[PDB]
Amino acid sequence: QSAKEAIEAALADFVKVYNSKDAAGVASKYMDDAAIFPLDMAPVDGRQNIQKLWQGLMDMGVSEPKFTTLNVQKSGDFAFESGSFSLKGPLVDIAGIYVEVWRKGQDGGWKLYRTIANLDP
Ligand SMILES: C=C1CC[C@H](O)C/C1=C/C=C1\CCC[C@]2(C)[C@@H]([C@H](C)CCCC(C)(C)O)CC[C@@H]12
Numbered sequence: 001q002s003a004k005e006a007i008e009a010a011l012a013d014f015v016k017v018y019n020s021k022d023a024a025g026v027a028s029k030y031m032d033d034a035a036i037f038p039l040d041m042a043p044v045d046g047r048q049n050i051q052k053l054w055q056g057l058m059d060m061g062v063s064e065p066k067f068t069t070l071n072v073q074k075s076g077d078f079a080f081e082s083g084s085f086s087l088k089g090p091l092v093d094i095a096g097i098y099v100e101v102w103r104k105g106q107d108g109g110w111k112l113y114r115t116i117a118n119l120d121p
Contacts, residue, residue, distance in 0.1 A: 004072040007081055007102060010110045011067045018065050021058055027051035030112045031103055039118040057087070064088040077104045078113070085117070096120045 001009075010029070017025040027047050036044040036053065044053050064087060071082040079102040086095040098117040102110040 003074040003079055004069060006110060007072050007079055008069050010102070011069060015065050015067065018054065018058075019063075023051050023055035023058060026054045034111070034113050034115075036115045036117065039116070041119075061090045062087050062094065078102065079104070079110060094119070 014026065014029055017029070027050050030047050030050050032047045034047060034050060036050060038044070044050055066086045068084045068086075069081060070084065073080045081100050081102065082098075083100075084095070084097050086093065088094065096117055096119040098115055100115040100117075101113045103113045104110055
């Protein structure tokens, strides 16, 4: 298993947990001091607030998440990722681009540390 495949597997699980409507499970995939920065929108800091974000999307009926990993570079205990995303809202397409950093755990699992994303118009 390569680094890209490892990240792709991590995101595949992310998708499954989201689709099970388990916002806490989604939030566990982040470091506690992780942060999401949606450009031209309010930053989201810490796992607790990140859980609220994903719970909010669930509550709004947002579905069918897809996260396409384009490029991955492993650097020390970090993995640097470029990708795209697409979701569906009540059906409305919600899509865009992101870059993000994962941190490898002692257990060998990857967790999200930093995400920067932008929504297409
Ligand atoms: C349009 C909606 C639905 C309606 C709401 O009012 C505003 C809004 C939020 C969507 C968000 C903003 C935060 C950043 C999000 C959550 C993106 C993620 C950060 C994308 C990266 C996902 C991952 C796991 C690869 O790292 C996807 C949708 C984006």
